[PDB]
């Protein structure tokens, strides 16, 4: 599969990230079993990335692009859109489906 976007709370419904814009997000990343492996909220610092520069996994590039500013959404991401067959040593296992709780705070 690719990325499934399920809304948690709505945004403005009008402002969607375009390629080249910087997305400012809070996020929590969990394995499919629910184990949290990464969270910007625990660090109390939002995460910024530039859309279209492949600084994030493909599921984020295609998923966050479907969110409007202010929206909080649950992204479910299959391994091909994520860390693949290889995964990430000691953090992400092979062939992992990942779940992200993502809030799009603003665009820069």
UniProtKB/Swiss-Prot annotation:
Location of the PPIase FKBP-type domain: 20-108
Activity regulation (UniProt): Inhibited by both FK506 and rapamycin.
Domain of life: Eukaryota
Positions carrying N6-acetyllysine: 53
GO biological process assignments: 'de novo' protein folding; amyloid fibril formation; heart morphogenesis; heart trabecula formation; negative regulation of activin receptor signaling pathway; negative regulation of transforming growth factor beta receptor signaling pathway; positive regulation of canonical NF-kappaB signal transduction; protein folding
S-S pairs: none
GO cellular component, one term: cytoplasmic side of membrane
Keywords from the UniProt entry: Acetylation, Cytoplasm, Isomerase, Membrane, Rotamase, Sarcoplasmic reticulum
Enzyme class (EC, first level): isomerase
Subunit-level organization: Interacts with TGFBR1; prevents TGFBR1 phosphorylation by TGFBR2 and stabilizes it in the inactive conformation. Interacts with ACVR1B and SMAD7. Identified in a complex composed of RYR1, PDE4D, PKA, FKBP1A and protein phosphatase 1 (PP1). Interacts directly with RYR2 and RYR3. Interacts with GLMN; rapamycin and FK506 abolish the interaction with GLMN in a dose dependent manner. Interacts directly with RYR1.
Protein name stated in the entry: Peptidyl-prolyl cis-trans isomerase FKBP1A
Organism of derivation: Homo sapiens
Lineage: Eukaryota, Metazoa, Chordata, Craniata, Vertebrata
């Amino acid at each position: 599969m690719g990325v499934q976007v399920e809304t948690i709370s709505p945004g403005d419904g009008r402002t969607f990230p375009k390629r080249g814009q910087t997305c400012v997000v809070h996020y929590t990343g969990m394995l499919e079993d629910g184990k949290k492996f990464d969270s910007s909220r625990d660090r109390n610092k939002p995460f910024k990335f530039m859309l279209g520069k492949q600084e994030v996994i493909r599921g984020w590039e295609e998923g966050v692009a479907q969110m409007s500013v202010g929206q909080r959404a649950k992204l479910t991401i299959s391994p091909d859109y994520a860390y693949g067959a290889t995964g990430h040593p000691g953090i992400i296992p092979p062939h992992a489906t990942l779940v992200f709780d993502v809030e799009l705070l603003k665009l820069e």
